[PDB]
Structure formats: structure tokens, C-alpha cells
Amino acid sequence: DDRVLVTETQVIRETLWLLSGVKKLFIFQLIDGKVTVRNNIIVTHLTHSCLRSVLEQIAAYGQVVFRLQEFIDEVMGPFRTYQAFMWALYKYFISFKEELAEIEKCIINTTITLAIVVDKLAPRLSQLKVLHKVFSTGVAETRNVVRASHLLNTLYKAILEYDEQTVSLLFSLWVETVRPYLQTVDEWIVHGHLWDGAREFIIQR
Amino acid sequence: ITEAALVRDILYVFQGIDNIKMNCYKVENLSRSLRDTAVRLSELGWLHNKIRRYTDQRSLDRSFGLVGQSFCAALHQELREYYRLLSVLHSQLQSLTLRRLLVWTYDPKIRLKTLAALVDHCQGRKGGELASAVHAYTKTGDPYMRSLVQHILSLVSHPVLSFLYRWIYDGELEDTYHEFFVASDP
Amino acid sequence: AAAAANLNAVRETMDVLLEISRILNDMETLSICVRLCEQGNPEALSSVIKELRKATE
Amino acid sequence: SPNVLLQNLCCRILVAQQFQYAVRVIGSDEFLVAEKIKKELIRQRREADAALFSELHRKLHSQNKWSILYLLLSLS
Amino acid sequence: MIHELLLALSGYPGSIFTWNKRSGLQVSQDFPFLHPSETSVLNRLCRLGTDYIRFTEFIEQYTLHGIYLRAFCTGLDSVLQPYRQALLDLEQEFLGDPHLSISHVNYFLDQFQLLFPSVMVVVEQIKSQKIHGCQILETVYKHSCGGLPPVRSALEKILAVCHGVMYKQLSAWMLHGLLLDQHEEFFIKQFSLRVEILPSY
Amino acid sequence: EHLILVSQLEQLHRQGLLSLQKLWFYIQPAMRTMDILASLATSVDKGECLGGSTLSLLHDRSFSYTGDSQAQELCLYLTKAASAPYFEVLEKWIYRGIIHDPYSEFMVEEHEYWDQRYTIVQQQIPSFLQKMADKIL
Amino acid sequence: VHDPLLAITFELTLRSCLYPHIDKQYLDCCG
């Protein structure tokens, strides 16, 4: 059986791209919306199997970030809530991307190997696992008023479960998703009329 | 059977892992001028297997108590030291011979002869009665032993002086296992 | 390439020698002593070093 | 070469009279040395340092030697 | 093989270090390149890896429910931090000089080898007796009076963070009249008091 | 220190530099030291000595070598080391009244109106405290 | 108004300070 025998540093660069959410990578070739490690990858060490083990874990993280990127894509290419929800998600990704991008700088310009970049990314791979469970309830579902109510209610329930850095994320993710309702509620009060779109509000007049 | 092979196995008999097999480590050829020094050098393992088993057997049940455990724990900081010396010796096998090894392991045949005879004098001692049977090894005079055991006593007698400073300033004795010499009646 | 490898080996040997000196206890003085020792005796060199230290005091 | 090295060593230690005395003095196994060093360490004790020294000696061989060790032992 | 091992001690098993669901980490069989006497020390070394894997698998699984179980695992990673950090170091020392053998690597663990074993049965008592509620703040405390100094200094940390939950709830009740609870955890349930769940000390 | 003087020759022998005639020179000091320790170890067992009488012997076997200076710097290392335990109970009997002496070896033993309580024992006198055998008690 | 409230016990009692913005406004309208 033949193998490609990739070098060592090349893997970390590829892993960073998987974290970034980019597709079409020589490693982690997805097939059906499910990232999956290749079969001919081997390093001088690590006996060709531990590599399939360590990559398999990071792959599980790629799924969490690839699916979210697929979600943001299906909104860009007037719900006023999902569109207001992704802007919170999108805002989190830019800052998260900066930490991953910064690491790439210290690679081209100190020794760096696998077991170091992972432990350096512990407080991120932790925060990311939460989103795989918070968003799972925002994707498993047809009317526009039940898809937005059941989503916004899942956050306020999931925060009371976590009552620190994980709470600061969900809270900063909450405010930027309840911004639509707080607007129309105020707009209904002072301007004396309910100005809704697609009957998004729960009061279907 | 070269001399480099025996040094290859001896560095493992110093731990318990067996040409040299397992009470003396009877070796099973080679010249008589080699078997004798091997039998002599391996005597350090039989002192090492016995001390490790004692700490292990007692590190299984919680019946030993707070004072006992402390003494058992004190037998590991005096074993990490014995696990380090082997690493430096191991790096030179790639030169040292049996004669060189004798001048190397002449001192840790004594520390592994007080500790391997300190865990037999206190076998069934649970509680303060243990901290009183590792103090009956300080009346020895030997400046190398009286300055080793008088350190294990400074660790074993720390839990005892933890109840005492509790049963004096606060009067709240608490020991599910009966160790302190002040026994309460419900 | 080969010259670079030789330089790395010399640097590693010097670092190991310095650690041994610290345990039995500068680097520039040790390098000069090592070169003299390699050429050729050892007891005589030690006596000269001790005398020089006494003169400095 | 050796004379120049001796002059450099004298300069580092510190003049001409001292150099002349050093020249006059100049004009005037390994296992055993290691054992002697271990014994000296034991007298100083301590035990942990002796174990480290044995590891260090092996490293030097992995990367003449007797003469360097004797000079270090004399300094003590 | 060194960097191969330092991953096996991290939670990633491979061909050299097979994984079994019942026994734990262990070496497959004899290897020609290495000596036949090392096949033992590794097995002595894996008795540590099995602990970290069975730790992190439980930590992730979160399994039983209740905040006091969530916080226990939250704290359980803190005591487990020096283990990871001391493992990253081993690679750096091996990157410098290429003359270090498994003996030195085995020697470096030293403290972790005598700590995990005593902090293994504390987890086993939980998953085998359904210790629900604040009763954890005693089951961990009854083992905090152990003799081993390292342990006495480990569990005390976990009890120091597990108290943060009670201290959160206790202050939330003693000044706001309400008790933030939905699983009957705190020892109060016209209110009443609870004794069958109240702490020991 | 004799188990080391066997090691250096071994290392030298691995090089062929140790002829039999060369051995008969290097061991000359190790043949004279091991001939003092093999004479105290037979003059301590001849007459059973323990306590003081095994400290009188090490003060006379050190005066008989008053001009050797190679076997007096030795017997003065044994006496200076085989008398610290005896001198650590003496520092408890002069500066305080307590006499520990678990084994019956000290010069003064207690009993159970006061001329019979503490009695000087005649055997266990170090023969260099003989001048002050009274001011101690 | 809710965001400045964050500047000057999380999301349950903290959320119980948002309503004074929505209640006083109501009191004026009905009044």
C-alpha cells in the first residue's frame, strides 16, 4: 500500500485551514457534508495509525465549523431574526479566526508541533463544543413564527443551565439575537402600531 | 555470553524485571569471575521488589490510616531518587563494566537496606503506633542512617501533630480511624 | 555542512563541561583550559591556576 | 601555539613576571578519576549531585577526557 | 517512538499501543527493534494512561445529573492540568539531546504515578452508587482527610471550587428569597429543611 | 575507599598497563591500612570490650604509634569517631542529671541514703578520663 | 437602554432590572 508521506509542519497549516472553515483541502476531504481524513497520510513517526487517530478528533471539530459555515452561506448567497442571529455567529468567527491566523505567523517566522497547538487552543475547542449543542436545536426545526420562537427560547434556557467565559459567550450571543423583538416591542409602544414582517412576531394579527 | 549482555540485564534486575531470573536472583555458559559479582549486584533488586510491594499492598486498602499512609507516601520520594540514578546509568550503557557499577551502586545498597528493613519492623502498626516505631530507628548513631530516618520521621509525624494542634486549640477531634491517643465515647 | 556539524558538537561538549564545573564548583577561562589540556601535566596546570588566583587576591 | 594559549590564560586570570613563572612551571585512568570525584562528592555531602555527575560523564563520552576531569577535580 | 509514546499518554492509541475497552492501554507484543525487557516498564507506564483516558471520557460524557456533578468535572480538569503541562515538557527535553531513553521519560511522570490511583476510586464511588445532589460535598470530603500530601492538596482544590456552587446558591437565597434550583440539589425544598442530603461537617 | 582502589587498576588493566610487578607497588598503602583494621578487629574480640573498655583500647593503640604518622592519623580517625556516642551521653550527665545509656555501658549507673544511688563502674572508664573519674560523678 | 444596564445573579435577577424600562413606559401610556 502506497502513502503520500507528508511532512510535519504541513499538517498544522492544513489543520488551521480546517479551523478557518475553508474547503477543498488535501487533507480532511469531505464527501457528503462530513469531513473525513484521507487514507495515505503518514509521517516518519506515529506509525500511520495514531495520525489517523489524532486527525480524527480534529475532524470532529471541523464538522462543527463546516456546518456553521454552511449555515451562514445559506443566508448570504426578510426574516430579521436568523439574519440577526448569524451576525452574532459571524462576529464570533472573525475574532476566533484572528487567533488561528496569528498562530500561522509564528510558523513562518520557535519550535511548533502537534501537541502544542492543540493545548494552546483548549479555551477555543471548549467554547466551540457548546455551539454544536446550542445550534443543534436551532437546526432540527416550518412556519416562520415557530422556527424563531423555539430558537430564541433555547438560548434563555441554555444559559440558566450554565449559571467564567462560557457564560460571556452565550450572553453576548443572546443580545444580538433578541435585538429584533426588542425593536418591534418598542416600536409598537411609542409609534402605536405593530410593524412586523412575514408575521415574525408571536401576535399574528 | 559477553560482559555487555550481563550489564544489559542487571540494569533491569535493579527494578524487579528479570539470563538473570528470580529468593536470590539465580543466574543461569559464563566464567565464575562473572556469576559471583552478578549475584552480589542483583541483591539490590531483591531489596527493591520487597519495598515496592509493601508500599503497593498498603496503597490498596484504606485501613492503614492517616499516619500509616503518610509513612507509605514518604517511601516514594525516596524511590523517585532511585528511579533517576538508573536513568543516568542507562545512558552510559550505549562505557561501564561490573567493576565500575560497584563504585556506582555502593551507596544505594545502604539506603535500600535501611528502607527494606524499616518496613519490616513496622508491619502491623496502624496509627500513631507507626510513628512510634519509625522513631525507634533513630537511636542508631550511624551519621548516614540517623540523618535519613530522622527525615521520614519528620513526614510521618506531621499528621500526628495535625490532630494535636486541633485537639488543643479547638477541641474538635475527628478521626474515623482510631489513631489519636484521645478516644471519645458517644 | 560537515564543518557546521563539527561546530555544533564542540558547542554541545562545552555546555556539558560547564555543567560539570558548576556541580564541582568562567566559560572563557574553561575554553582556554580545555584547549591547553588537549595539547598535553594536568597537575602542573592546576598548580599554576591556583598560584595565579592567589596573586589576583 | 601552546605558549600563546598559556599567555592568554594568564591575561584572563589577571604580569610579565607572572607569565615567566607560569612558563617555568610548565617546563617543570578516566574511571579512577570518576571514582575519585564521586568520593569527593560523598565527603562534601550531595548524593543527588553525584548521580547527576555520572549521567553528565556518559553524555560527554557520547558527544584527553581524563586530563580535563583531573583539572576540574583539583579546583574542587 | 518517543513522540509516539507521548501521544499514547495523551489519549490517542495506535498500532504499537493498542486500546481495549475493558483492560486499558497496553503494549501489543514483542518488538524486534526495542529490547524485550522494556515491554514491562511501558505496561507500568500505561497504568497511568488508562487513568487519563477513563478520566477524559467521563469528563466529556458528564455522566446522573445535577450542577454539583457539572462543577465536579469542571474542577476535575483543573487538578488534571499539571499532568498535561508536564507532558508537553518531555517533548522539549527530547528535542534538545537525542540520547534520552524511556528510563528518563518514566522517571519524569513520578508524581502523576502516585496521584491518579488514589483519585481513581473517588470517581468509581460516584458512578457506582448514584451519588446525586450535594452529597458529593461529603463523599469528596471523606477522602480529603487522606495521608498522602499530594492527594490532600488535590481534592482540597476540587472542594474549593465545588463550594463555589453552594456559595452561589446560598447567597442567592439568603438575600433574594428564592432558590435557583430545578433538580432538588440544595438542601431546602412554606418551605422546609432537608437532612438526608445535608453535608456532614 | 578500598573498593575504589580496586576499580582504578581494573580500568588501567583494560589497557594492558598493569603487570604483576606493577601491582605489588600500587597496593603498598592498602596493605598497611588493612593491617591496622585487622589488628583492632582482633584486639576488640580477644577481650570482650563494649562501652568504655573499647575506648581505652583505641587510646592505647593510638599512643603505641606515636612516631609512625601513617598509622596514627588512622587510629586517631577511629577514636575520634568511636567516641562521639559515648560523649553525647556525657553531655547529658554533666549539663543535666538524666542518664539514658540504654545498654549498660556508661561509667555511671543509677539504682533504686544517696551513696548507693549512683555508683562509679570501674570497668567502663575510658582510661583517659581516669584523672577526672570523680568530678564526673 | 438594555445594553447600558449591563454597564452599571445573571439573567434571572439581572433580567429583573430590564422591566423597569418597559413598565414605567407602559405606566405613562395607560395613564
UniProtKB/Swiss-Prot annotation, chain A:
It comes from the Eukaryota. It is found in: Cytoplasm, Cytoskeleton, Microtubule organizing center, Centrosome. Widely expressed, with highest levels in heart and skeletal muscle and moderate levels in brain. Component of the gamma-tubulin ring complex (gTuRC) consisting of TUBGCP2, TUBGCP3, TUBGCP4, TUBGCP5 and TUBGCP6 and gamma-tubulin TUBG1 or TUBG2. TUBGCP2, TUBGCP3, TUBGCP4, TUBGCP5 and TUBGCP6 assemble in a 5:5:2:1:1 stoichiometry; each is associated with a gamma-tubulin, thereby arranging 14 gamma-tubulins in a helical manner. Gamma-tubulin at the first position is blocked by TUBGCP3 at the last position, allowing 13 protafilaments to grow into a microtubule. Belongs to the TUBGCP family. Component of the gamma-tubulin ring complex (gTuRC) which mediates microtubule nucleation. The gTuRC regulates the minus-end nucleation of alpha-beta tubulin heterodimers that grow into microtubule protafilaments, a critical step in centrosome duplication and spindle formation. This is Gamma-tubulin complex component 5. It comes from Homo sapiens. The lineage of its organism: Eukaryota, Metazoa, Chordata, Craniata, Vertebrata. The gene is TUBGCP5.
Swiss-Prot record, chain B:
It is found in: Cytoplasm, Cytoskeleton, Microtubule organizing center, Centrosome. Ubiquitously expressed. Component of the gamma-tubulin ring complex (gTuRC) which mediates microtubule nucleation. The gTuRC regulates the minus-end nucleation of alpha-beta tubulin heterodimers that grow into microtubule protafilaments, a critical step in centrosome duplication and spindle formation. Belongs to the TUBGCP family. Component of the gamma-tubulin ring complex (gTuRC) consisting of TUBGCP2, TUBGCP3, TUBGCP4, TUBGCP5 and TUBGCP6 and gamma-tubulin TUBG1 or TUBG2. TUBGCP2, TUBGCP3, TUBGCP4, TUBGCP5 and TUBGCP6 assemble in a 5:5:2:1:1 stoichiometry; each is associated with a gamma-tubulin, thereby arranging 14 gamma-tubulins in a helical manner. Gamma-tubulin at the first position is blocked by TUBGCP3 at the last position, allowing 13 protafilaments to grow into a microtubule. This is Gamma-tubulin complex component 3. The lineage of its organism: Eukaryota, Metazoa, Chordata, Craniata, Vertebrata. The chain holds residues 245 to 452 of 907 of the full protein.
From Swiss-Prot, chain E:
GO terms for molecular function: gamma-tubulin binding; structural constituent of cytoskeleton. Belongs to the TUBGCP family. It comes from Homo sapiens. Component of the gamma-tubulin ring complex (gTuRC) which mediates microtubule nucleation. The gTuRC regulates the minus-end nucleation of alpha-beta tubulin heterodimers that grow into microtubule protafilaments, a critical step in centrosome duplication and spindle formation. Coiled coil: none annotated. Ubiquitously expressed. Keywords: Cytoplasm, Cytoskeleton, Intellectual disability, Microtubule, Primary microcephaly. It is found in: Cytoplasm, Cytoskeleton, Microtubule organizing center, Centrosome. This is Gamma-tubulin complex component 4. The chain holds residues 1 to 267 of 667 of the full protein. One of its GO terms (biological process) is cytoplasmic microtubule organization. It comes from the Eukaryota. It is linked to Microcephaly and chorioretinopathy, autosomal recessive, 3: A disorder characterized by congenital microcephaly and chorioretinal dysplasia associated with poor vision and nystagmus. Variable ocular anomalies include microphthalmia, retinal folding, retinal detachment, optic nerve hypoplasia, absence of retinal vessels, round areas of chorioretinal atrophy, and attenuated electroretinogram. Most patients have mild developmental delay and mild learning difficulties. Its main location: cytoplasm.
UniProtKB/Swiss-Prot annotation, chain F:
Changing residue 32 to C: In CDCBM15; uncertain significance. Transmembrane segments: none annotated. It is found in: Cytoplasm, Cytoskeleton, Microtubule organizing center, Centrosome. Disulfide bonds: none annotated. Belongs to the TUBGCP family. It is linked to Cortical dysplasia, complex, with other brain malformations 15: An autosomal recessive disorder characterized by global developmental delay, variably impaired intellectual development, speech delay, facial dysmorphism, microcephaly, and varying degrees of cortical malformations including pachygyria, thin corpus callosum and subcortical band heterotopia. Most patients have generalized seizures. Component of the gamma-tubulin ring complex (gTuRC) consisting of TUBGCP2, TUBGCP3, TUBGCP4, TUBGCP5 and TUBGCP6 and gamma-tubulin TUBG1 or TUBG2. TUBGCP2, TUBGCP3, TUBGCP4, TUBGCP5 and TUBGCP6 assemble in a 5:5:2:1:1 stoichiometry; each is associated with a gamma-tubulin, thereby arranging 14 gamma-tubulins in a helical manner. Gamma-tubulin at the first position is blocked by TUBGCP3 at the last position, allowing 13 protafilaments to grow into a microtubule. This is Gamma-tubulin complex component 2.
